[PDB]
Amino acid sequence: SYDIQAWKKQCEELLNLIFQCEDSEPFRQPVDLLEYPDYRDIIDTPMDFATVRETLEAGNYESPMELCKDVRLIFSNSKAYTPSKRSRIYSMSLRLSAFFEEHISSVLSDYKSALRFHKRNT
Ligand SMILES: CC(C)NC(=O)N1CCN(C(=O)c2ccco2)[C@@H](C)C1
Incomplete structure (x- = not known):
């Protein structure tokens, strides 16, 4: 399974699944700095799943590792904002994660396998 490009549609389909999860609701759009005017004091780099989908569809990820780093930033931002480990929105974040x-994991493994095959004889 050595298709170097296959990660992109695999990531589109996984983002579609995430958008169907009720647990994604708080993470589907950038946080509004009205309801949370301090948000930028705590969080240096906002991220959300609509920003990830747009970056992918623009052709602005080179690898599924870069998409993975942005998705993990959604979850670390929710960790950085939670008052406790017992919040509706933080709890939703840990299930979605x-x-x-x-x-x-298979998307990353298949991509890295495909790149090693492409360099097998270099
Ligand atoms: C719907 C809208 C786009 N999202 C939003 O207003 N958020 C999501 C991010 N966020 C958390 O992560 C959080 C942790 C604990 C409590 O809140 C809050 C700032 C609320």
Whole structure:
């Protein structure tokens, strides 16, 4: 399975699954700096799943590792903002993260395998 390009549609389909999860609701759009006027004091780099989908569809990811780093930033930002480990929105974040990690591992493995095959004889 040595298709170097296959990660992109695999990531589009996984973003579609994430958008169907009720747990994605708080993460589908950039945080509004009205309801949370301090947000930028805590969080240096906002990220959300619509920004990730747009960056992918623009042709602005070179690899599924870069997409993975942005998705993990959504979850670390939610960790940085939660008052406790017992919030609705942080709790939703940890379930969505488990689901994402379960599905992205094969995408990453297949991509890195494809790149090693492409360099086998270099
Ligand atoms: C719908 C809109 C785009 N999202 C939004 O307003 N958010 C999502 C990010 N966020 C958290 O991560 C959080 C952790 C604990 C409590 O809140 C809050 C600032 C609320």
